[PDB]
From a paper:
We focused our attention on human RAD51, an ATP-dependent recombinase crucial for homologous recombination (HR) and for error-free repair of DNA double-strand breaks. We therefore explored the possibility of using a more stable orthologue as a surrogate and focused our efforts on archeal RadA from Pyrococcus furiosus, a protein that was already structurally characterised and is closely related to human RAD51. Here, we describe the complete process of generating robust, RAD51-like surrogate systems from this archeal protein via two distinct approaches: by stepwise mutation of the surface of the RadA to humanise the BRC4 binding area (HumRadA series of mutants) and by generating an archeal/human chimera (ChimRAD51) in which all of the BRC4 binding part of RAD51 is stabilised by parts of RadA.
Numbering used by the authors: 109 to 283, 289 to 295, 307 to 328, 336 to 349
The structure:
Amino acid sequence: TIGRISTGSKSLDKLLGGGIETQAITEVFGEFGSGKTQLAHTLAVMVQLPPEEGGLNGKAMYIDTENTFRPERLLEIAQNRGLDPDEVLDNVAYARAFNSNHQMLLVQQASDMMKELLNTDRPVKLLIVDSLTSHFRSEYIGRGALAERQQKLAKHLADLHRLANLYDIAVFVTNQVQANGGHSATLRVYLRKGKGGKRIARLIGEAVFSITEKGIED
Ligand SMILES: [Ca+2]
């Protein structure tokens, strides 16, 4: 549907109101193996497709903080969906965020890059930040550092929301459930492991999906 990227699952798209939205931040929470990273890799392929096939004829940028990006997985999803894998890999730009300060600087650097590429036929339409809070949690420790950590995270989310609106891109971020917090910034989706190997998504009703050779499916 209009301005949305399909997840690869019709059930998950229905729950999301058609898929992930441009000009917005979608935040997916869950433990390791819940489907969050698999969903990010599938969306990096889906965004490239025409709108009738659930994409935006776009490119993706994947920012990693905990070594989760797998080009071979994109290659596999592309091959299994009948798409050209070299084209798919050429359209997903990868950058590692080394620490929380660098992670925050990457938003302005991505903004500078998208600006110069304004005339391009295939613009970036999806920005993924996998494990959004990992560097903030490991660099701000002790009870006294919590307020500062939250303040820096809020500023980072505000910079991402501004990026989504200046370039009409979908921002997709992954995180883990927090004992304290907190959004204001988003659309929050919790992912769980289901029976057998299915995964369940819930908005913070519910939708069932699976992890296959094609990435995310029903
Ligand atoms: Ca996963």
